[PDB]
Each structure stands twice: as structure tokens, then as C-alpha cells.
């Protein structure tokens, strides 16, 4: 519709993140977040020792 003039695409997902504490220097949180979908092609993102 001319009143809308655009669209928004909202992409939910479940992220696989890394258990990381916030460092004192803290330039950024070094948390390697990857979409759970990636695990179907490269399951190594789920490896946990």
C-alpha cells in the first residue's frame, strides 16, 4: 500500500553462544554467536569438551 511504503523482515532464531565473562578492558564481548541452523552443515560449532 502507498501508505506503507516499505516492508520489514524480522528473522528470529536460536543462537549458539559461548560461555564468556566480561573482561575488565572489555573492548567487546568475545562471544562467538552462530545461528543454530549452521549446525546442520558444520556440527563442530556444538563441540563441548
Amino acid at each position: 500500500n502507498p501508505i506503507e511504503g516499505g516492508v520489514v523482515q524480522v528473522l528470529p532464531y536460536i543462537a549458539v553462544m559461548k560461555d564468556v565473562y566480561h573482561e575488565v578492558s572489555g573492548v567487546k564481548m568475545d562471544n562467538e554467536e552462530v545461528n543454530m541452523v549452521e549446525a546442520y552443515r558444520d556440527p563442530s560449532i556444538l563441540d563441548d569438551e
Partner: protein
């Protein structure tokens, strides 16, 4: 939005997907 920006609520419910597939299959039988 429709429901809300909470990413947890945006996720589609598996039980609703199963029901939907059952409803779509039965609708097709009613047409055919």
C-alpha cells in the same frame, strides 16, 4: 508486530505446526 518483538514469542510453536499440517491435509481432502 503480530505478537511482539520478544524473540522467544516470534518462534513458531511445533505443536501448532503439527496441527497446521493436519488441517492443511484435511482441507485438501475436502477440496478433492
Amino acid at each position: 508486530l503480530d505478537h511482539g518483538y520478544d524473540a522467544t514469542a516470534l518462534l513458531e510453536t511445533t505443536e501448532d505446526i503439527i496441527t497446521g499440517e493436519l488441517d492443511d491435509h484435511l482441507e485438501s481432502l475436502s477440496v478433492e
